[PDB]
Ligand binder design. Structure first.
Ligand SMILES: CCCCCCCCCCCCCCCC(=O)O
Length: 133
């Protein structure tokens, strides 16, 4: 199943091309202004077959609870109301968000003890790297 070294609290240390990613998602100006200032905290936890990813930032908290492979509804930090699915591939937590026909993907991999999140919308590739506290 999902490796228990995902589990824990992560804080962002590196972000590349986040603004372009928000622009691809259609985030407005006022939200873009704030999103680039945030260095969120991500807390991954496991209760049975339910996985919970909680993102904490000064501007907004978000949380999603899900079972792998089972689709759920999600309101994103930027208030997209998506139907999303999380799957396990090759040690990669892979999330796909579906809304108004568009699609974006966030892939979370462990590398050297860090959590690297790759975010893909259209042709823009945002990479966000989290260190475990
Ligand atoms: C998530 C930062 C705080 C909230 C800022 C609101 C701007 C909307 C951002 C779009 C979704 C971001 C996806 C986060 C991926 C991750 O690093 O886990």
């Amino acid at each position: 199943g999902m490796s228990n070294k995902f589990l824990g609290t992560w804080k962002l240390v590196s972000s590349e091309n986040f603004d372009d990613y928000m622009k691809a998602l259609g985030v407005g100006l006022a939200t873009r202004k704030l999103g680039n200032l945030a260095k969120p905290t991500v807390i991954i936890s496991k209760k049975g077959d339910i996985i919970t990813i909680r993102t904490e930032s000064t501007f907004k908290n978000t949380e999603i609870s899900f079972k792998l492979g089972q689709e759920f509804e999600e309101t994103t930090a930027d208030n997209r109301k998506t139907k999303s699915i999380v799957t396990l591939q090759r040690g990669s937590l892979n999330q796909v968000q579906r809304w108004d026909g568009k699609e974006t993907t966030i892939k979370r991999k462990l590398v050297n003890g860090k959590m690297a999140a790759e975010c893909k919308m259209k042709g823009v590739v945002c990479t966000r790297i989290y260190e475990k506290v």
